[PDB]
């Protein structure tokens, strides 16, 4: 705790490049509480809701609609330009995972967001993160 | 056989052919080829002259398979022709074909008299071997 508090000072005192500055600049509350409430209602179906609809379709020989979640799946939805909006968290612990992520949405002209999350995105979709 | 040795004969002679004055002692002149330019200079110059120095270019990583070129003369081509087939060989008629690279002998040379005219298939040949088998009545056919 004495070095997670000095880690926060040191990221503030030093001059930060514009690629990590952009995660300190976050979408506001009215657009974040609107966003995660829309990510909540199109969250993926759970394990019981996916164990059913398949055991109720093995009887038909006897995925409704959701948000794209995951760092391998959301990347494909931009290379294909299928996503209409991407919502990026701001505090992934190796930051290089999504450091490139706003510039991919910018090269392909998908609207993106950097919201104050990774606990609040996983709560919206049923994960921890 | 130990019984055939000089040891068994001079057994009892208490010096074993090494003498009373100067004994048999461990390495009285050095170990090995020590002193080749110093105290064995007369031995190394007289018997082994061209030692001690450098000569020529350095062929780093010599491969002795591409520099393969064995040699046979015209008088030894009877070594490669079967005894059934040399007797039927006459100049101006049907001559036996000798495939040299199947026998060693990458190059034909032209020493001596060729004792049987034949068609030689050789990778290499010389001036005086080509000249001397076309007059004898055969030929030489190049191969790879």
């Amino acid at each position: 705790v004495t070095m997670q508090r000095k880690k926060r000072v040191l990221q503030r005192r030093l001059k930060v490049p514009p690629a990590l500055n952009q995660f300190t600049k976050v979408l506001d509350r009215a657009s974040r509480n609107e966003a995660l409430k829309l990510i909540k209602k199109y969250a993926p179906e759970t394990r019981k809701a996916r164990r059913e609809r398949l055991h109720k379709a093995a009887e038909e020989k006897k995925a409704p609609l959701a948000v794209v979640t995951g760092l391998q799946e959301v990347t494909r939805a931009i290379e294909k330009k299928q996503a209409r909006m991407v919502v990026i968290a701001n505090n992934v612990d190796p930051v290089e995972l999504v450091l490139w992520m706003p510039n991919l949405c910018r090269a392909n002209k998908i609207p993106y967001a950097i919201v104050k999350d990774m606990a609040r995105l996983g709560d919206a979709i049923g994960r921890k993160t | 056989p130990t019984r055939f040795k000089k040891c068994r004969h001079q057994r009892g002679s208490t010096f074993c052919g090494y003498g009373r004055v100067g004994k048999h002692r461990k390495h009285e002149s050095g170990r090995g080829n020590a002193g080749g330019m110093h105290h064995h200079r007369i031995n190394f110059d007289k018997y082994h002259p061209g030692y001690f120095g450098k000569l020529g270019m350095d062929h780093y990583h010599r491969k002795k398979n591409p520099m393969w070129k064995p040699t046979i003369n015209l008088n030894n081509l009877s070594r490669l022709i079967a005894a059934e087939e040399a007797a039927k060989a006459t100049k101006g008629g049907t001559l036996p074909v000798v495939d040299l690279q199947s026998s060693g002998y990458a190059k034909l040379l032209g020493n001596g008299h060729i004792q049987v005219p034949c068609i030689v298939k050789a990778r290499y040949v010389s001036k005086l071997a080509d000249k001397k088998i076309r007059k004898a009545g055969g030929a030489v056919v190049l191969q790879a």
Binding site: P17, A19, L99, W100, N103, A107 | Y124, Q143, A144
Partner: protein, 97 residues
């Protein structure tokens, strides 16, 4: 097409006459092709992180001329001379807009 060999031991085409076959396509033939997705990824990352201390130095005096000094500064720090030419030529494209 595969240029038949002349049946004697020396010269051009100096081999055994053997009815040569054409070269057949391998999976390693796909290295000499343009990697248009591997370049698009590298163009996004380069437009993200900025420039090296080498890449800023090579083109801060590629503005004032000094092209053989840019090549000498690359070969000192890249070692190779083909890579020194290419790194200087990659800086001249970033200066071309």
């Amino acid at each position: 097409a595969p240029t038949p060999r002349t049946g004697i031991i020396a010269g051009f085409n100096k081999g055994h006459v053997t009815t040569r076959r054409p070269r057949q396509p391998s999976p390693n033939d796909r290295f000499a092709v343009p990697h248009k997705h591997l370049r698009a990824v590298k163009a996004i990352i380069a437009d993200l992180v900025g420039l090296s201390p080498l890449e800023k130095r090579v083109q801060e005096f590629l503005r004032v001329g000094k092209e053989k000094r840019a090549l000498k500064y690359c070969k000192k720090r890249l070692g190779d001379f083909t890579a020194a030419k290419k790194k200087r030529s990659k800086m001249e494209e970033a200066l071309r807009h």
